[PDB]
Ligand binder design. Structure first.
Ligand SMILES: *Cc1c(C)c(=O)n2c(=O)c(C)c(C)n12
Ligand SMILES: [Cl-]
Ligand SMILES: [Cl-]
Ligand SMILES: [Cl-]
Ligand SMILES: [Co+2]
Ligand SMILES: [Co+2]
Ligand SMILES: [Co+2]
Ligand SMILES: [Co+2]
Ligand SMILES: [Co+2]
Ligand SMILES: [Co+2]
Ligand SMILES: [Mg+2]
Ligand SMILES: [Mg+2]
Ligand SMILES: [Mg+2]
Length: 310
């Protein structure tokens, strides 16, 4: 008799259509509606990267493929996936309430972001556990980080190796690897937040496995509050490294992100590409994991290790 468990898969969320941009960004901006010029700019950015609908499908495909793969690779537990999002429905609290309604009493959760931080992961896990306590009769064990799962490191190692192998010889010998995640306010350091240290370790592990001796760590997508954010930003970092040593190719691995959305398809593939085009360097950014089987198997291993079953 297989034990039934909920599988709570958490992520940032995306709009589902253009008419959701206003409410999604209002939520991100803590209740402040974007001005009309910003709404129009955002619509244009989503159009430029191919549209909203495909981006909105990825978390669903990740959760569905993870549920089915976990149920196939072991015989003790039957998982059912529930998606809980930060900035649009279904919200984290909606997902926990659905688990409770459906008779789930025991769940494991994972955030689709590999590094722990106090701003994101800790907040998602605390929200899920508080809703479970309010409803009663349900407990959640939560994954806190997974950047160091060997199967996840290997996903990026093999993509980097392929990109370097594809380069002309002069590029391969004069290239720079930039490994990045979403910036946060520097003030997280007051709490001892390990997020920066974990990004640096991701970068070390990926460069090491791929045999890439020249690499750098940067941040992207910072906000505009007056307090300093973690830097350097990838755009400034790229230009500075070019001025120092004249690299002919830049390879971007935004390891903090696991799915296509604006902060990769725009903040790397447009904003960093503007800089590389300006300095005459080639631009490379290997594929995001999305719902590919190699990545799903890494996530399933993370979950089963957390439960002590591997
Ligand atoms: C809020 C937001 C946007 C606009 C974006 O592109 N992304 C991501 O990639 C994440 C993880 C989050 C949150 N967002
Ligand atoms: Cl936590
Ligand atoms: Cl953990
Ligand atoms: Cl951790
Ligand atoms: Co247009
Ligand atoms: Co136009
Ligand atoms: Co199916
Ligand atoms: Co399937
Ligand atoms: Co550093
Ligand atoms: Co952001
Ligand atoms: Mg319409
Ligand atoms: Mg750990
Ligand atoms: Mg920006």
């Amino acid at each position: 008799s297989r034990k039934k468990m909920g599988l709570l898969v958490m992520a940032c969320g995306t709009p589902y259509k253009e008419e959701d941009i206003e409410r999604y960004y209002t939520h991100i901006r803590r209740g402040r509606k974007p001005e009309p010029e910003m709404l129009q700019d955002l619509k244009d950015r989503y159009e430029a990267i191919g549209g909203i609908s495909p981006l909105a499908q990825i978390t669903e495909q990740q959760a569905h493929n993870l549920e089915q793969h976990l149920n196939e690779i072991q015989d003790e537990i039957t998982f059912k996936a529930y998606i809980g999002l930060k900035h649009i429905e279904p919200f984290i609290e909606d997902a926990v309430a659905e688990m409770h309604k459906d008779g789930i009493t025991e769940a494991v959760s994972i955030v689709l972001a590999p590094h722990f931080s106090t701003f994101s992961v800790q907040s998602y896990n605390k929200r899920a556990k508080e809703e479970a306590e309010k409803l009663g009769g349900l407990t959640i064990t939560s994954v806190e980080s997974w950047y160091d799962e060997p199967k996840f490191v290997t996903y990026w190692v093999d993509r980097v190796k392929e990109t370097y192998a594809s380069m002309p010889e002069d590029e391969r010998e004069n290239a720079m690897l930039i490994v990045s995640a979403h910036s946060l306010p520097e003030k997280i350091k007051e709490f001892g937040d390990p997020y920066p240290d974990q990004l640096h370790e991701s970068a070390k592990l990926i460069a090491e496995g791929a045999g890439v001796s020249e690499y750098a760590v940067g941040w992207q997508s910072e906000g505009n509050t007056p307090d300093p954010w973690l830097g350097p930003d990838v755009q400034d970092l790229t230009r500075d490294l070019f001025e120092q040593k004249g690299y002919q190719a830049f390879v971007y691995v935004p390891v903090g992100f696991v799915a296509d959305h604006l902060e990769v398809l725009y903040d790397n593939d447009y904003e960093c590409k503007v800089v590389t085009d300006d300095i005459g360097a080639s631009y490379y950014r290997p594929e995001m994991p999305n719902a590919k089987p190699e990545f799903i198997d890494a996530l399933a291993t993370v979950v089963l290790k957390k439960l002590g079953r591997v």
